[PDB]
């Protein structure tokens, strides 16, 4: 009610900024704030308060704010020096932003649900989830983002999608990531070279995300199968070759024409460092395949599965022998060749 | 030089994976306790609360 008097308006706005919760925002209070805006115009302290009201009830207010300047003046308060004494006493975008689930949920509803009428359970709001102990209590019930690509750089949501295997979320992530990779790639689909560093950073984020979760995305496999023929072998060598290691286990004969026929043609005509790089990546791929196969026997037949890995080993042995012949017995290559057989 | 680089990366990966394993153990204990609690835990009764 103190918002009416002009003398106290800026200070009450600051106080109401901290106390505001979901229960406090009500439609009739929403009309009062709009009325005050007509009389006084574009007051900076009102713009901050209105934005907080829109966040809690997006179905009532719509505000677009220009860009972040400090709305409330951070003037040195009279007790600031004393607070230092008190503090001593106490002491002594390519990726979407995170937003709550889309407000078309519910939308036109005839009446409240019976479960809601009885106040049964609910869901955990996304804004409240900010600490690991808070995640531990409410892992079973969570609110998903509006756009699922925002999970990529959020560590707490990665723990949730580590064990979900739900289909609609997988499809949403698939479509977003496949379209993004297609649009941002360098030698494929309009050959953009401006992104250069942005694509490398995006690929690093993806790699760091799939080192956790101990598996690869479905979008990445499709991107490799589509864009491998057009690759020159040098543009994003590290990240591109680190994406290869996370290819799901499958019969060797099926994926050979898709992947290894191009890799071998690029292998025999390139420099020695490319050869060492591909030997490293194939060793990591073998380790990942073995790691996933071992847990299954604790739980295609086993005889069929071993045939694929044996064919992969023989293929890389053929690669190694021909590579030694081409390079005239260079010892730098022999170290990597023996590194593979150590595993 | 290549061997030195490999060893450095191995050590960093080791510490990171250790942290991940700790967090995942905590989550597994929480899931076990929660499932146990839920497992431990009609028109006539519903009409009563109304």
């Amino acid at each position: 009610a103190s918002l009416q008097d002009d003398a106290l308006c800026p200070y009450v706005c600051h106080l109401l900024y901290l106390l505001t919760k979901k229960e406090n925002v009500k439609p009739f209070r929403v009309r009062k704030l709009l009325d005050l805006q007509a009389k006084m115009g574009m007051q900076p302290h009102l713009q901050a308060l209105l934005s907080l009201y829109k966040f809690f009830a997006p179905a009532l207010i719509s505000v677009s704010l220009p860009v972040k300047k400090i709305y409330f003046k951070n003037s040195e308060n009279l007790w600031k020096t004393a607070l230092l004494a008190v503090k001593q006493r106490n002491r002594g975008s390519v990726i979407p932003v995170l937003n709550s689930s889309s407000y078309t949920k519910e939308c036109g509803k005839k009446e409240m649900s019976l479960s809601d009428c009885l106040n049964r359970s609910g869901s955990f709001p996304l804004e409240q989830l900010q600490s690991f102990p808070q995640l531990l209590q409410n892992i079973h019930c969570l609110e998903l983002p509006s756009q699922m690509g925002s999970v990529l750089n959020n560590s707490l949501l990665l723990h949730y999608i580590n064990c979900v295997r739900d289909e609609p979320v997988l499809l949403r992530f698939y479509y977003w990531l496949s379209q993004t990779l297609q649009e941002e790639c360098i030698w494929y689909k309009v050959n953009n070279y401006e992104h250069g560093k942005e694509f490398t950073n995006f690929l690093d984020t993806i790699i760091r995300a799939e080192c956790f979760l101990q598996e690869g995305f479905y979008s990445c496999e499709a991107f490799l199968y589509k864009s491998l023929p057009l690759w020159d072998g040098l543009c994003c060598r590290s990240q591109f070759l680190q994406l290869v290691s996370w290819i799901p286990f499958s019969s060797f004969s099926e994926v050979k024409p898709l992947l290894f026929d191009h890799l071998a043609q690029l292998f025999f005509t390139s420099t020695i460092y490319f050869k060492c790089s591909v030997l490293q990546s194939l060793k990591e791929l073998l380790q990942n395949w073995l790691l996933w196969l071992s847990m299954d026997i604790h739980m295609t037949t086993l005889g069929g599965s071993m045939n694929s890995v044996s064919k992969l080993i023989h293929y890389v042995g053929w690669l190694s022998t021909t590579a030694m012949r081409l390079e005239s017995n260079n010892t730098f290559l022999l170290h990597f060749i023996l590194d593979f057989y150590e595993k | 030089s290549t061997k030195e680089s490999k060893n450095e990366k191995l050590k960093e990966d080791l510490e990171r994976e250790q942290r991940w394993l700790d967090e995942q153990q905590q989550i597994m204990e929480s899931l076990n306790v929660l499932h146990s609690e839920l497992k431990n835990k009609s028109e006539s009764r519903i009409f009563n609360e109304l």
């Binding site: 590290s238 680190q242 420099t271 060492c276 490293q280 | 680089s5």
Partner: peptide, 12 residues
């Protein structure tokens, strides 16, 4: 990592 090291060996 080793792959970035091989890249920078290539660069020289």
């Amino acid at each position: 990592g080793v792959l970035a090291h091989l890249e920078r060996l290539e660069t020289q």
